[PDB]
Design a protein around this ligand. Structure first.
Ligand SMILES: [Mg+2]
Ligand SMILES: [Mg+2]
Ligand SMILES: [Mg+2]
Ligand SMILES: [Mg+2]
Ligand SMILES: [Mg+2]
Ligand SMILES: [Mg+2]
Ligand SMILES: [Mg+2]
Ligand SMILES: [Mg+2]
Ligand SMILES: [Mg+2]
Ligand SMILES: [Mg+2]
Ligand SMILES: [Mg+2]
Ligand SMILES: [Mg+2]
Ligand SMILES: [Mg+2]
Ligand SMILES: [Mg+2]
Ligand SMILES: [Mg+2]
Ligand SMILES: [Mg+2]
Ligand SMILES: [Mg+2]
Ligand SMILES: [Mg+2]
Ligand SMILES: [Mg+2]
Ligand SMILES: [Mg+2]
Ligand SMILES: [Mg+2]
Ligand SMILES: [Mg+2]
Ligand SMILES: [Mg+2]
Ligand SMILES: [Mg+2]
Ligand SMILES: [Mg+2]
Ligand SMILES: [Mg+2]
Ligand SMILES: [Mg+2]
Ligand SMILES: [Mg+2]
Ligand SMILES: [Mg+2]
Ligand SMILES: [Mg+2]
Ligand SMILES: [Mg+2]
Ligand SMILES: [Mg+2]
Ligand SMILES: [Mg+2]
Ligand SMILES: [Mg+2]
Ligand SMILES: [Mg+2]
Ligand SMILES: [Mg+2]
Ligand SMILES: [Mg+2]
Ligand SMILES: [Mg+2]
Ligand SMILES: [Mg+2]
Ligand SMILES: [Mg+2]
Ligand SMILES: [Mg+2]
Ligand SMILES: [Mg+2]
Ligand SMILES: [Mg+2]
Ligand SMILES: [Mg+2]
Ligand SMILES: [Mg+2]
Ligand SMILES: [Mg+2]
Ligand SMILES: [Mg+2]
Ligand SMILES: [Mg+2]
Ligand SMILES: [Mg+2]
Ligand SMILES: [Mg+2]
Ligand SMILES: [Mg+2]
Ligand SMILES: [Mg+2]
Ligand SMILES: [Mg+2]
Ligand SMILES: [Mg+2]
Ligand SMILES: [Mg+2]
Ligand SMILES: [Mg+2]
Ligand SMILES: [Mg+2]
Ligand SMILES: [Mg+2]
Ligand SMILES: [Mg+2]
Ligand SMILES: [Mg+2]
Ligand SMILES: [Mg+2]
Ligand SMILES: [Mg+2]
Ligand SMILES: [Mg+2]
Ligand SMILES: [Mg+2]
Ligand SMILES: [Mg+2]
Ligand SMILES: [Mg+2]
Ligand SMILES: [Mg+2]
Ligand SMILES: [Mg+2]
Ligand SMILES: [Mg+2]
Ligand SMILES: [Mg+2]
Ligand SMILES: [Mg+2]
Ligand SMILES: [Mg+2]
Ligand SMILES: [Mg+2]
Ligand SMILES: [Mg+2]
Ligand SMILES: [Mg+2]
Ligand SMILES: [Mg+2]
Ligand SMILES: [Mg+2]
Ligand SMILES: [Mg+2]
Ligand SMILES: [Mg+2]
Ligand SMILES: [Mg+2]
Ligand SMILES: [Mg+2]
Ligand SMILES: [Zn+2]
Lengths: 37, 204, 140, 174
RNA sequence: CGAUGUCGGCUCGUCGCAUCCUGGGGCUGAAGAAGGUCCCAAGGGUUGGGCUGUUCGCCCAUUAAAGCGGCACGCGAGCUG
RNA sequence: CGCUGAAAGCAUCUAAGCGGGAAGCCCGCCCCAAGAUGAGGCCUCCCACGGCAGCCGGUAAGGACCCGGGAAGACCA
């Protein structure tokens, strides 16, 4: 999980979701998981 | 929960399987049931045990009325065991078998006014290298202008001992019903001759 | 002419059902009743409002996410002695205290204000033990 | 472009009775109560159940599809029922049925017995396949997720408990 | 400035968390074992020596770890000097 | 980290709902504790005494004083 202030799509499989008041990026590539923070 | 009132009689050691076992000897029973606490009447469950018979010429009328309503001879001590409802009307050492673990509660020995070193195991001060009349003193008790006060619960000199203490999970080494004797492995609070309470341990 | 000052009066016992009412907006009315400011002879320096019985206090209502996020706080005077109890837990453990606390904070500080707070009797569940006072049911 | 508007076929004989805030579905395999938002209206037609929303606001548009699928999942559950299949992989790994309970040997120092909750049945056709079946779709997937979690698929070997159909994706080592 | 005693140590703590350890996690260029990196977490714990006034630091021998800061660079109507 | 799942025909731990999950949080253990003036409860004891929500005096159940002491303690308790 990458925790950063700039969460962005890294590849075209990346999906930006909003989950319980936070921005996450979920993707089939585990390196691309992001949480804003 | 099961319990019994007792007297701490003394310490010795026995030999069990070529091991010396330190024991405290306790004279426990017999304890008459003098009153039962019920949820309907009192809002909780307990049995009020009596212990050590007393000279009736020392028992005043309200106490006598309390005993007589129970059909019990005058006794010196009344104590309750919480959440205990014995079937009989008399609790004896046989509620405990050898091998059971028990909690024991007594009044610890009284140190009276105790210093910081005996009461709280403070380090005190140096005994040479210029130390000036502070060999047993506590040192600093705070900070400066912030917060400009001393915390509640600060450890300081004062009375120490003569207070209720429970020691937990003591092995019952032997039970001698003929003499109402409980043998408990280890140390038990208070002086010989002190009143104690023995209960089934709360440690699983 | 001097302003009218009442001689002492029989207080009025009053009954309020808390179920479904919003915590804060119910409390301000109870506080008004305790101060007796609904009464035309209101006098600020004597205890002369109603006695207020409240039932179903455990059924008080609350907006937003306050059940989880409203924290009651107590300080014991000891290091680390700040206790934080969320509203959820207070309702699960001493529910009558939610309304009591809300009302107490809306009464004046001081001897008269503490006196007025004793005239408020809050109960969880639909029953109260004050039939002998025959409380008058109120809709607020 | 809409699940909420899509009518729900009801096979005879399944009964769909409506009540405020809930929908009760009874069928040949049991009953299910579906909690339903009071803002939504569920309507019974001939061999068909439909759900309608009272506006085009986002919350109503969001509850509309949800309510349709939940009702439909209940209709399927009492008639067809639901099931999920787990493949156990890895040399020593196997399962058996101890009574109606599931015992997994999957590499720990001990077995793992899984007790079935109410409404869940366990089947072990072969030692390396486990079936989880019941009327409640959410529950079937939950129990199945639990059993997969005993020993998840490894990142480096075809070893662990897999969903049937789950693709085996591995990482190299050395 | 008709005085707010000033480094370091000792004693006694208490707090913050940007966490040294222990507990829970995600990612790994994670086979395992051991690491790396970030996230949650302040409940407790966080050794004894040589040098030097030292704080610090280096070194010796260990350790799960030998955390960093605030409290008038905490604490001289408590001691040292 | 999931289940089920729309808005958004797919997808999504979430917008409805459900689960798992820390030495940490609540309780559980130990000790204090009804001046908790919101002053709680139970058992038992004495009794409605004379004379002018008050005063005066003699008593009851009880207590205190005093004395012998105590692994209780500075005195006090
Ligand atoms: Mg891109
Ligand atoms: Mg995806
Ligand atoms: Mg005692
Ligand atoms: Mg002494
Ligand atoms: Mg000392
Ligand atoms: Mg000592
Ligand atoms: Mg000590
Ligand atoms: Mg020392
Ligand atoms: Mg020295
Ligand atoms: Mg010394
Ligand atoms: Mg000197
Ligand atoms: Mg001197
Ligand atoms: Mg000296
Ligand atoms: Mg000192
Ligand atoms: Mg201050
Ligand atoms: Mg004492
Ligand atoms: Mg023996
Ligand atoms: Mg002794
Ligand atoms: Mg009004
Ligand atoms: Mg005024
Ligand atoms: Mg509200
Ligand atoms: Mg309560
Ligand atoms: Mg106020
Ligand atoms: Mg003011
Ligand atoms: Mg039909
Ligand atoms: Mg219509
Ligand atoms: Mg490698
Ligand atoms: Mg100056
Ligand atoms: Mg001066
Ligand atoms: Mg001056
Ligand atoms: Mg001066
Ligand atoms: Mg510090
Ligand atoms: Mg942190
Ligand atoms: Mg750390
Ligand atoms: Mg770890
Ligand atoms: Mg390797
Ligand atoms: Mg590893
Ligand atoms: Mg890691
Ligand atoms: Mg993270
Ligand atoms: Mg992270
Ligand atoms: Mg900590
Ligand atoms: Mg702390
Ligand atoms: Mg620390
Ligand atoms: Mg060192
Ligand atoms: Mg030296
Ligand atoms: Mg030397
Ligand atoms: Mg040195
Ligand atoms: Mg040095
Ligand atoms: Mg240096
Ligand atoms: Mg150098
Ligand atoms: Mg080592
Ligand atoms: Mg380690
Ligand atoms: Mg500092
Ligand atoms: Mg500075
Ligand atoms: Mg400086
Ligand atoms: Mg300083
Ligand atoms: Mg320092
Ligand atoms: Mg200083
Ligand atoms: Mg000095
Ligand atoms: Mg100094
Ligand atoms: Mg000073
Ligand atoms: Mg000074
Ligand atoms: Mg000073
Ligand atoms: Mg000098
Ligand atoms: Mg000198
Ligand atoms: Mg998934
Ligand atoms: Mg899904
Ligand atoms: Mg789309
Ligand atoms: Mg939700
Ligand atoms: Mg849960
Ligand atoms: Mg959960
Ligand atoms: Mg799970
Ligand atoms: Mg532990
Ligand atoms: Mg007590
Ligand atoms: Mg009292
Ligand atoms: Mg008490
Ligand atoms: Mg109070
Ligand atoms: Mg009382
Ligand atoms: Mg007398
Ligand atoms: Mg004496
Ligand atoms: Mg004297
Ligand atoms: Zn991606």
């Amino acid at each position: 999980m990458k925790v950063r202030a700039s969460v962005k799509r890294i590849c075209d499989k990346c999906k930006v979701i909003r989950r319980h008041g936070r921005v996450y990026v979920i993707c089939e590539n585990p390196k691309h998981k992001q949480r804003q923070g | 929960m099961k319990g019994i009132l007792g007297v701490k009689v003394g310490m010795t050691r026995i030999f069990r399987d070529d091991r010396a076992v330190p024991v405290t000897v306790i004279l426990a029973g017999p304890c008459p049931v003098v009153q039962r606490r019920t949820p309907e009447k009192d809002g909780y469950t307990a049995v009020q045990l009596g212990f050590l018979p007393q000279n009736p010429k020392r028992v005043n009328r309200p106490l006598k009325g309390h005993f007589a309503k129970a059909g019990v001879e005058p006794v010196r001590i009344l104590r309750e065991i919480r959440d205990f409802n014995p079937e009989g009307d008399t609790v004896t050492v046989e509620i405990f078998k050898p091998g059971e673990r028990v909690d024991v509660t007594g009044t610890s020995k009284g140190r009276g006014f105790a210093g910081v070193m005996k009461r709280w195991n403070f380090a005190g001060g140096p005994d040479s290298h210029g130390a000036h009349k502070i060999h047993r003193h506590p040192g600093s008790i705070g900070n400066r202008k912030t917060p400009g006060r001393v915390y509640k619960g600060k450890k300081m000199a004062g009375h120490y001992g003569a207070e209720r203490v429970t020691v937990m999970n003591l092995e019952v080494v032997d039970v001698i019903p003929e003499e109402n004797l409980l043998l408990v492995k280890g140390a038990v609070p208070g002086p010989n001759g002190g009143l104690v309470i023995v209960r089934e341990t709360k440690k699983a | 002419m001097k302003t009218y000052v009442p001689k002492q009066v029989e207080p009025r016992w009053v009954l309020i059902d808390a179920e479904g009412k919003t915590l804060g907006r119910l409390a301000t009315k109870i506080a008004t009743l305790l101060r007796g400011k609904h009464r035309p002879d209101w006098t600020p320096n004597v205890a002369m409002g109603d006695f207020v019985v409240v039932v179903n206090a455990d059924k008080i209502r609350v907006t937003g996410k306050k059940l989880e996020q409203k924290i009651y706080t107590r300080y014991s005077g000891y290091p680390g002695g700040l206790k934080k109890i969320p509203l959820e837990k207070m309702l699960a453990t001493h529910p009558e205290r939610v309304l009591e606390h809300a009302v107490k904070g809306m009464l004046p500080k001081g001897p008269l204000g503490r006196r007025l707070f004793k005239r408020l009797k809050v109960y969880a569940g639909p029953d109260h033990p004050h039939q002998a006072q025959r409380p008058e049911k109120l809709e607020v | 472009s809409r699940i909420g508007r899509l009518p729900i076929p009801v096979p005879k004989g399944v009964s769909v009775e409506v009540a405020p805030g809930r929908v009760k579905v009874k069928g040949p395999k049991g009953e299910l109560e579906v909690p339903v938002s009071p803002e939504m209206r569920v309507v019974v037609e001939e061999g068909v159940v439909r759900v309608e929303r009272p506006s085009d606001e986002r919350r109503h548009k969001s509850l509309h599809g949800l309510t349709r699928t939940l009702i439909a999942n209940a209709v399927k559950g009492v008639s067809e029922g639901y099931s999920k299949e787990l493949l156990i992989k890895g040399i020593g790994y196997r399962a058996r049925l101890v009574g109606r309970a599931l015992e997994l040997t999957v590499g720990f120092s001990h077995p793992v017995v899984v007790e079935p909750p109410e409404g869940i049945t366990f089947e072990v056709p072969e030692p390396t396949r486990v079936r989880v079946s019941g009327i409640d779709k959410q529950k079937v997937g939950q129990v199945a997720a639990n059993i997969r979690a005993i020993r998840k698929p490894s990142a480096y070997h075809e070893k662990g408990i897999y969903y049937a159909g789950e693709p085996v994706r591995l990482k190299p080592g050395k």
